[PDB]
Write a protein that binds this ligand. Structure first.
Ligand SMILES: N=C(N)c1ccc2[nH]c(C(=O)N3CCC(Cc4ccccc4)CC3)cc2c1
Ligand SMILES: *[C@@H]1O[C@H](CO)[C@@H](O)[C@H](O)[C@H]1NC(C)=O
Ligand code: NA
Ligand code: NA
Lengths: 12, 28, 250
């Protein structure tokens, strides 16, 4: 299925 | 790297994985 | 990977996952060759015929993973990219010749039981191990069949195939910068890499010093595990000079 949410620190 | 290619959970502990023997056995 | 099996924990500590920021998805495989450099296939980042052109800010590199979709807290490390280098002569218009790229991490990653670099071959190791009949190992979170996804990293061991056999199995013009691997229809064994696996490593264990060396990069194939067809891999040693150049100069 889809992927699990990863920490927001790695999306900025 | 100095210790490149040596896996902590395998080579460093002298433990072999499930199928590496297959690779080694093919190297005539 | 098609017809492979689940990998053991820490079995491929150099395996890297190329992860797209938004929409969050798996793009390709890759390999860790040092604390700050990742090796992958150029077509994973650039392939104009499909309007694919990712830049440093478009993705993340996930290291030390085993499970394909879970965020493995305290185990995996997610890194940002500082710079991407694609081979100046990567041939995407015709046959994916020189399908290779380097990615410089913003910050070095710490090694651990699950994160450890693979070795790059030297002329002697390559000449000694790159022979028809000799088996290598491919790993990846790619498709399980041509036409779904595995829960954890998959692994398959495949024999290197004679160049004539590789050439005579396709219409594509094959170059010195690639080699093909896989079982022949009559060998009664199957397995191949597949979409999602590209960029990943094809490794071999040296019987001389017991180290694992990355001899190839999953590049392309027609379908997956089709009889009479073979997986094609970028010849890493053949392109080592360019790799060293990029690392040394940058
Ligand atoms: N069975 C395999 N070993 C295998 C492994 C990796 C792969 N990646 C792709 C894939 O999606 N590609 C993008 C489109 C490309 C089309 C192509 C094919 C030959 C020459 C030039 C371009 C192939 C790679 C197909 C494919 C097949
Ligand atoms: C790909 O994206 C880059 C942005 O860095 C752009 O400069 C280039 O023109 C684009 N197309 C190709 C084929 O590189
Ligand atoms: Na041909
Ligand atoms: Na095949």
């Amino acid at each position: 299925g889809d992927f699990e949410e990863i920490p927001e620190e790695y999306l900025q | 790297e100095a210790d490149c290619g040596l896996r902590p959970l395998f080579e460093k502990k002298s433990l072999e994985d499930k199928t590496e023997r297959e690779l080694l056995e093919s190297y005539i | 990977i098609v017809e492979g099996s689940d990998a053991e924990i820490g079995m491929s500590p150099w395996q890297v996952m190329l992860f797209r920021k938004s929409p969050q998805e798996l793009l390709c495989g890759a390999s860790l060759i040092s604390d700050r450099w990742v090796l992958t296939a150029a077509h994973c980042l650039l392939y104009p015929p499909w309007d694919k052109n990712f830049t440093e800010n478009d993705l993340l590199v996930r290291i030390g993973k085993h499970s394909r979709t879970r965020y493995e807290r305290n185990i995996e490390k997610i890194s940002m990219l500082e710079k991407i280098y694609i081979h100046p002569r990567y041939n995407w218009r015709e046959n994916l010749d020189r399908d290779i790229a380097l990615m410089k991490l913003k910050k070095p990653v710490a090694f651990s039981d699950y994160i450890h670099p693979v070795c790059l071959p030297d002329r002697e190791t390559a000449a000694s191990l790159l022979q028809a009949g000799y088996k290598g190992r491919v790993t990846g979170w790619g498709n399980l069949k041509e036409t779904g996804q595995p829960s954890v990293l998959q692994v398959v061991n495949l024999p290197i195939v004679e160049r004539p056999v590789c050439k005579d199995s396709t219409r594509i013009r094959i170059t010195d910068n690639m080699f093909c691997a896989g079982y022949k229809p009559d060998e009664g064994k199957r397995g191949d890499a597949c979409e999602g696996d590209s960029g990943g490593p094809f490794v071999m264990k040296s019987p001389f010093n017991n180290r694992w060396y990355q001899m190839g990069i999953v590049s392309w194939g027609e379908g997956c595990d089709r009889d009479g067809k073979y997986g094609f891999y970028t010849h890493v040693f053949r392109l080592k000079k360019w790799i060293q150049k990029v690392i040394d100069q940058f």
